[model samples]
Target chain A: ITPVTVIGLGAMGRALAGALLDAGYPTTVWNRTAGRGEDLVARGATLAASPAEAVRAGEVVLVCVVDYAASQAILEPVAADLAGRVLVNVTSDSPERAREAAKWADGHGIRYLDGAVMIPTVMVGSTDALLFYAGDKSAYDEHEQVFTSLGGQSAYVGADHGLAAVYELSMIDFFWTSMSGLVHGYALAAKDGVPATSIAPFLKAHISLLSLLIEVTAKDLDAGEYPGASGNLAAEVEGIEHILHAAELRGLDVSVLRSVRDVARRAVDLGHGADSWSATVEGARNP
Target chain B: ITPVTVIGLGAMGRALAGALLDAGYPTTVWNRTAGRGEDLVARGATLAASPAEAVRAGEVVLVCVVDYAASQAILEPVAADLAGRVLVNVTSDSPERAREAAKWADGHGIRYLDGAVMIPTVMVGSTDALLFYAGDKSAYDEHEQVFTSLGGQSAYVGADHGLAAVYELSMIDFFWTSMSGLVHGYALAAKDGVPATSIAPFLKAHISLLSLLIEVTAKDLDAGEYPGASGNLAAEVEGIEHILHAAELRGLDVSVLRSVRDVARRAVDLGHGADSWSATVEGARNP
Candidate 1:
């Protein structure tokens, strides 16, 4: 069996170490602060005294830390120990930072794969767990079994070394905005004497509409076409006007709605009035 | 058969008239301009020459026009004819406007039902079509079958004349913001050289996460508790920081993402650092 070393024993790091040990992968672990891996130590795993010792103990090393800077703090001094070994980073960071780490790894003869764990710590070893990696394909292909031990649905995005971070961040960006919107809707409903719980089922059902829009908007934007056969931006902007009036009447916050309406109205003024809602992409692209 | 008069021959109005005619109802139609509903006229439907004549032709009068103002223009002059008749206004308008129209109808002895068609014109009369009505539950129960002819999922919200409009606007508010967030994701992905089409499937899959979140957040908010055993606002804000940096690196628009992050950060600063994301509703509520 190929040995694995998990550096950093935070909640996520411990999860990774536990999964590896559960898979019977001769797991070696280390943390900046000790006692985070006592359970791992009891699970037939070795606790290395130092980062260099951890890297020396395994062919594939995984690091899950606060960010790239922290990861670098642990690994940079052990560069000699990581030479010719696979270094997989599951830390959360910007794509540019991931790329910078990858570039640094290439110069040091360290095989690198940028990765992201897309599930909670409790879900780390589950069959439905999702994880993504991007970088040297050969390194990912060789250790695919080890990664899948942490997540059954582990995916390889690309060889860019930044695609994993890009995909993860993009999804997070989409999620945060959407949940904030739902919360905004709840605030509006509360002012109108409706409870958040009462409106939640409707909001859940409304997510299906987003699925349909994703397909349509994606296809339209990819083709550089903005057909409005079903509905146009002009009509949508008009509808938003009514919503704004309702919000204003209730003395609720209208900033987000107004921003959305302003974008669509800008698209309309720029001759996309008859175009589909996807046409608002032009405004986003330029702004 | 209950005779139905649809006064307005726009696309939606024509669809309503056609659905009624298809169901073998005695349907009368009128329009500000002629030629918009020739097909409805040809399908054994009466073409009333004026709004008053249209109101007098049918027991249930369905008026779908530009807005409440336009509906008032057509119905105010015919208030005498509308007496003791069911006046269903399906025109798009604010809740306040809907209530105002309902009050006007009550003053003239008209049984009123404020309505909203939730599906597109093409989907009208389909087995999966959806529509909502509010006000005078007795009127809606009496004409339930007629309303179902336009939509299989026709629902009566409440006695409040504005409920239907409230439901529709709330749903729209959610949809517009969610779709705009998805588009912003596309914009970021395009900057990363990821095609919109390629990233769309992943975005769709990510929507399931929102479904899970809606349930959790709704329950937490309803209970007035925000446990963060899984994750919290501090961690979420950190993830968003990476996304904002990525957007800045790519020179893409960051307004929406920044707004979202600012809200979460504010919540964190207000001692919600350990609270679930639903805690951000505080910012929306106060703003």
Candidate 2:
């Protein structure tokens, strides 16, 4: 059985340690602040007094923190303890930062892998949870079975340590903007005296539509082809205009929608008007 | 069998006429421009010479044009022909425009209904197609079966004549912003030298997570209660900041994402720091 150490007792960090413990691994946990992991200590897990102590207890050290900087601050002082061990960083940060962390690990003779958790705290141990890692396939292959204790689905994405960050950050970009737009829609509907519940099912249906769009856009982007078989960019530009008009009529803020409309209009101006909406990616990729 | 006349032969209008014809309705279609519906004509649809001629050819006149003004322009001069006939305007327009059209029909002794097609032209005759209508339940009741010829699913939402537009417009709001966000993500990934197809599956997994968020947010908005049991507003604010940082690092445009982050920060400033991410709806609703 592989011993696991979890640092940073945030919601995600605690979940990681708890899942490993539930799987009957000898777990060691540490956090900067005390009283955060009392349950883990009560469940026969070791509570290390410091980061150095925590890292020494397990062959695999999982660092789940708020950002790369925070993780670096905690791990830099314990690089000696991390040497000859696998440093699995599941922290959220920019791709550059992840690469820097990987470089830092290389200088210290440590095997490093960057990971991104794709599920919430409650879903940490569920079979539906998925976590992705990148860098050092040898290190991944050595502990691939150990990674399964964290989530039912765990995969090594690439040899580049930054690929995990690329995946996660790109998804964050999509998630925040889309969720913000969705909640804004809820506000707009509420302003018009429409119940949020009334719009939920339709919103779900549109999500299915978006899934199809995502699939099509992916293929178009990969092939460098933008086809308008179903609808053209010109029609999409008009659609955004209609939305902006509706939003403004409600006296709500239309800045976000206006930004999107501007992107489409720019693509239209670039003579991709007859192309598919996916052609807007040209403006996005360059701008 | 109910005789159906479709005015304004754009893609959507043509599909409506084609679907009606396929469903064994005596379909007549009229467009201001020529050569748009030759296929429908070949499929045994009557190509009416004028709007009046079109209105007189069927018991129900379905107007599936670009906007409310276009439909109004085509239907106003033929009000006498539309009298006592069901005038179904499935044009994409604002709630105010839909209600105004409904009022115009009321003054002209027309049994009017406003509709918005939820599917693309290709899906018009499929069971997956959904079309929503509002205003004059009596008109809807009389023509519900005929409406099914245009779409396997035809739902009457309300009697206000603006509810259908409300639903469609709100979904459009969610659709464009979210989709723009999605493509922006692809652009960011492409600039990072990551393959679009590589991120496609993770992008999809995140969409599923978004589905869950939408359901939770909908319930919160409906109950006027936003709980932060899973995650708080401040964390989301920070998450958006990370995305902005990542986007800026790649020299990609962050205007749309910035607009979203601003909303979340504003909510945090309003002392919703510990509330759920749905709390951002307050800023959206007010600002």
What does TM-score give for chain A of every model?
0.93, 0.96
TM-score per model over all chains: 0.94, 0.97
Model 2: per-residue lDDT, tens digit, A1-287?
Answer: 98999999999999999999888899999988899899999997899998999999999999988877889999999999899999999988778888899889999999999999978888887776788899888999998877887887776889999888777777778888888888878878887899888888777777888888888888998888889998899988998888788888888888889888887777888889999988988777556
Candidate 1 residues B1-287, lDDT tens each? 99999988887898899899889999999998878878877889999898889999999999888765676677798899999889998877888888888888899899999998877778789766778899998999998999999988778889999888877877777777887788778778888888888777677556787788777877777677789878778988888888888777777667777777877777787789988888887766556
Error in Å for residue A39 of model 2: 0.4
Model 2 misplaced stretches (Cα beyond 4 Å): B67-70
Give each candidate's fraction of reference contacts reproduced.
0.59, 0.74
- Which DockQ value does candidate 2 get? 0.75
lDDT of 1 by residue, A1-287 (tens): 99999999998999999999888899999988868889889888899998889999999999989878889998899999899999999988777888999988998999999998877788898776788899999999998999999998788999998899878877777777788777777667767776667767666546876777888888888888999997788998998888777877887666677878877777788889999899998877766
- Model 1 per-residue lDDT at A64: 87
**TM accuracy, model 1:** 0.94
On a 0 to 100 scale, what is the lDDT of residue B192 in model 1? 82
* Residues B13-126, model 2: lDDT tens digits: 888888888889999989889999899999999898988998999998888878656766778988988998999888787888888888989898999899999887888887
lDDT of 2 at B248: 83
